[PDB]
Amino acid sequence: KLATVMAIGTANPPNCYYQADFPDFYFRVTNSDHLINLKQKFKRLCENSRIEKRYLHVTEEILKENPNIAAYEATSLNVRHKMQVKGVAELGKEAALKAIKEWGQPKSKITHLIVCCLAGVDMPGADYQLTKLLDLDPSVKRFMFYHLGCYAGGTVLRLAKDIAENNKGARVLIVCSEMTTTCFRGPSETHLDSMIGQAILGDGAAAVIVGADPDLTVERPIFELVSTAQTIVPESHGAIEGHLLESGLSFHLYKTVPTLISNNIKTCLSDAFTPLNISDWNSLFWIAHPGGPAILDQVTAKVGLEKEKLKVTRQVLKDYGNMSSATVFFIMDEMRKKSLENGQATTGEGLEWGVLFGFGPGITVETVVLRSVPV
Amino acid sequence: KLATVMAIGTANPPNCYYQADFPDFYFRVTNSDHLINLKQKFKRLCENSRIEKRYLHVTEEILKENPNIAAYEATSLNVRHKMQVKGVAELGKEAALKAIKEWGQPKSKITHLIVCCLAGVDMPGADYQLTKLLDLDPSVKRFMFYHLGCYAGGTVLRLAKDIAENNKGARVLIVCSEMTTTCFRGPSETHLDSMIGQAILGDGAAAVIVGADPDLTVERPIFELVSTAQTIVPESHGAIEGHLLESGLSFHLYKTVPTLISNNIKTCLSDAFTPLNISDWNSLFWIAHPGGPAILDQVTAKVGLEKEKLKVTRQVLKDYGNMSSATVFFIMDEMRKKSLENGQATTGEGLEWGVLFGFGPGITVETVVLRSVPVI
Numbered sequence A: 001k002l003a004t005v006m007a008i009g010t011a012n013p014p015n016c017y018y019q020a021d022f023p024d025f026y027f028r029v030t031n032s033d034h035l036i037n038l039k040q041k042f043k044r045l046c047e048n049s050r051i052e053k054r055y056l057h058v059t060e061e062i063l064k065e066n067p068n069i070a071a072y073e074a075t076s077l078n079v080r081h082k083m084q085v086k087g088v089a090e091l092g093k094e095a096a097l098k099a100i101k102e103w104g105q106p107k108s109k110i111t112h113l114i115v116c117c118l119a120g121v122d123m124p125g126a127d128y129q130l131t132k133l134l135d136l137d138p139s140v141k142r143f144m145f146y147h148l149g150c151y152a153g154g155t156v157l158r159l160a161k162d163i164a165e166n167n168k169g170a171r172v173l174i175v176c177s178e179m180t181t182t183c184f185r186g187p188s189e190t191h192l193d194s195m196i197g198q199a200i201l202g203d204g205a206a207a208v209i210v211g212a213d214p215d216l217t218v219e220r221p222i223f224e225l226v227s228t229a230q231t232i233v234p235e236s237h238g239a240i241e242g243h244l245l246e247s248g249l250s251f252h253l254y255k256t257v258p259t260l261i262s263n264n265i266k267t268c269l270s271d272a273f274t275p276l277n278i279s280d281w282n283s284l285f286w287i288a289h290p291g292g293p294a295i296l297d298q299v300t301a302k303v304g305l306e307k308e309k310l311k312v313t314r315q316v317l318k319d320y321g322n323m324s325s326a327t328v329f330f331i332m333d334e335m336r337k338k339s340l341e342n343g344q345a346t347t348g349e350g351l352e353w354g355v356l357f358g359f360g361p362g363i364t365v366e367t368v369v370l371r372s373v374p375v
Numbered sequence B: 001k002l003a004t005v006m007a008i009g010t011a012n013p014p015n016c017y018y019q020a021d022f023p024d025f026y027f028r029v030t031n032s033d034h035l036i037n038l039k040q041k042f043k044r045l046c047e048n049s050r051i052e053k054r055y056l057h058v059t060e061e062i063l064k065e066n067p068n069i070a071a072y073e074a075t076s077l078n079v080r081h082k083m084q085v086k087g088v089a090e091l092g093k094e095a096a097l098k099a100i101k102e103w104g105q106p107k108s109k110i111t112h113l114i115v116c117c118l119a120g121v122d123m124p125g126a127d128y129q130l131t132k133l134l135d136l137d138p139s140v141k142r143f144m145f146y147h148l149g150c151y152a153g154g155t156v157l158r159l160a161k162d163i164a165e166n167n168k169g170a171r172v173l174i175v176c177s178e179m180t181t182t183c184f185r186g187p188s189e190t191h192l193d194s195m196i197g198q199a200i201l202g203d204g205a206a207a208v209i210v211g212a213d214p215d216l217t218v219e220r221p222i223f224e225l226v227s228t229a230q231t232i233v234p235e236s237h238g239a240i241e242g243h244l245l246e247s248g249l250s251f252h253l254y255k256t257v258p259t260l261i262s263n264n265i266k267t268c269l270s271d272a273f274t275p276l277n278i279s280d281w282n283s284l285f286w287i288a289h290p291g292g293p294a295i296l297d298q299v300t301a302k303v304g305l306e307k308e309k310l311k312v313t314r315q316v317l318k319d320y321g322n323m324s325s326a327t328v329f330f331i332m333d334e335m336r337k338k339s340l341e342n343g344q345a346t347t348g349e350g351l352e353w354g355v356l357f358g359f360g361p362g363i364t365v366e367t368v369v370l371r372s373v374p375v376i
Helices: A019-029 A036-048 A060-065 A077-103 A126-133 A152-166 A196-200 A257-262 A265-276 A293-303 A311-320 A324-341 B019-029 B036-047 B060-065 B077-103 B126-133 B152-166 B194-200 B257-276 B293-303 B311-320 B324-341
Strands: A003-011 A016-018 A053-055 A112-117 A141-146 A171-178 A204-211 A223-232 A240-245 A285-288 A353-360 A364-372 B004-011 B016-018 B053-055 B112-117 B141-146 B171-178 B204-211 B223-232 B240-245 B248-253 B285-288 B353-360 B364-372
Touching: A003 A077, A003 A152, A003 A324, A016 A019, A019 A036, A019 A053, A019 A060, A036 A196, A053 A311, A077 A112, A077 A126, A077 A171, A077 A204, A077 B240, A112 A126, A112 A152, A126 A141, A126 A171, A141 A152, A141 B141, A141 B152, A141 B223, A152 A171, A152 A204, A152 A223, A152 A324, A152 A353, A152 A364, A152 B141, A152 B152, A171 A324, A204 A324, A223 A265, A223 B141, A240 B077, A257 A293, A265 A293, A265 A353, A265 A364, A285 A293, A285 A311, A285 A324, A285 A364, A293 A311, A311 A324, A324 A353, B004 B077, B004 B324, B016 B019, B019 B036, B019 B053, B019 B060, B019 B194, B036 B194, B053 B311, B077 B112, B077 B126, B077 B171, B077 B204, B112 B126, B112 B152, B126 B141, B126 B171, B141 B152, B152 B171, B152 B204, B152 B223, B152 B324, B152 B353, B152 B364, B171 B324, B194 B248, B204 B324, B223 B257, B257 B293, B257 B353, B257 B364, B285 B293, B285 B311, B285 B324, B285 B364, B293 B311, B311 B324, B324 B353
Parallel strands: A112 A141, A112 A171, A285 A353, B112 B141, B112 B171, B285 B353
Antiparallel strands: A003 A204, A003 A223, A016 A053, A171 A204, A223 A364, A353 A364, B004 B204, B004 B223, B016 B053, B171 B204, B223 B364, B240 B248, B353 B364
């Protein structure tokens, strides 16, 4: 009896930013219009991001109220955290309620709560906050993960799988609430990669309910968690880093990331699927963290995937941008929705087996083998 | 087959601070010798702490180089984190190596790594650093917990239990590496919370190996993880809070913390032990996070524990102070050591069943039911 995803709910801040207008907005609110060459670089980052829009808690008003946030490097952790701590909770609450609704069981049946937040360190944490906000059982078993990064969607599933499978009747609520208020900052001519964060990172929360042995008279499985794995890409040291400083969470991304990830994907696939006697990567449905269009293009090319295999993944990137750990669940959600609309037999675009990838600091790759459920 | 603790290793910074001399040290290195009145309150704080010594990464030299850390509140997070990130990994590595040695298996057999650090946020984190430092399998399945606090000893065991029992052959290395460099700060007349942490918090790391179905020809069980629970103490909102600020980590505890926790213990005991048909709290061996001397006194009093029940717990507090999440493992380690020296029948002071408690922000209480193992 495999751990099974039985519900997915998502939420995003109400402020929508169309990518086509972001360069002008970003350079204006960060008083960087005098940096003509830097603006062209940023403009191109946005144009090549393959992101059409994003939802952000940050607004021009908030930046006016907090100039130290608009600055590339200014003491601002305190003001960022004040907003971050509240934002991840409220956004996570919205997503959790939607997940709980789809799940179909009363929230009192939630036995475990896993919360994952890029930033917003607080003691007690967002897990405690959500327990109070959702009025969950005070004895709900919680796990709180701060600062894991973009591979965390796989991490929370890896955890949920073992919890669900080792505890009869366990019903795990996962909440990945990602807010970039702690990362949002002005551009730097000396650290050109920092602004990549403002070109691709969006806000969003995803909640999922995971449990083994579904009560088919009320619960409705979406995807089964077959196996999970995590690995560190060889010779990838320092390619993706984030430091929590007095100026908030930094963003470091080396130009080698796309090739490092794409060149190692087949190994992750082989390790995960050889045990299942599966070698045709195109026979799987794909849910890959859209760290960037380069990663997706290179993975598609190097793995030998058909052009549209990552269609849903690319669509989510286009509609919401990179929402860190929550992204893969938006993709998972949209995939089962599109599968239904396209009249396909399974939640995985009609295919039986699938793979979910999380990519992040390490470089770390989380590989989750999934099995679809009939539509 | 229950997840089983098969090894425990510990480590502490090389700088030992005797509590009897800390008041003078503290106010001296923080240029607070002029605050005679406040110095008296701190001296009293340390005297009733029941802590004889602590090991800290901070030194007079470090404070002289970083006066912004010595100040009660000054933009100093960057300098703090630089040391914190390095410290937790180095201290964690030492404890891990010791645990691995006791375990008796090649480190290549480690399948999962759980790292827990009060502070030292970094991406990638301490789990990544330790994987590299210990040269563990690149595919080791890692879990990294930052800023959980003092109940985390139970949290990591609760996690390790499910990992080990749901994955045949899984061998989990847990590393709780706690350093207080991020929360060390000078005294302030307009503040009276952060001063308590300066008197009770110590540095230290503990590592343990957890696995189900031990290979008895090489592995040697110490304690079995029977059940785990986590709960939020009723009407305790805001009682224990910690915030990571530009001035580092700051804690604020209501004076009611000891009472809130102690009054809730019997409930945790009942929930965890009624299913095992156990009701005599003195029939269990005890491992309780020594948040402070008050918590130990009130738990003993309200629960009705005989004087020797928290002996090891109190001894660890006396010898190391409050080392956050790592503490319960120092206690677990010392308990089986003393049990052996006392020629007792089990690793749990000759008793069969035991309980490990973690107390922290929430207020959160982690309750782990333990089973000792026979000792020849």
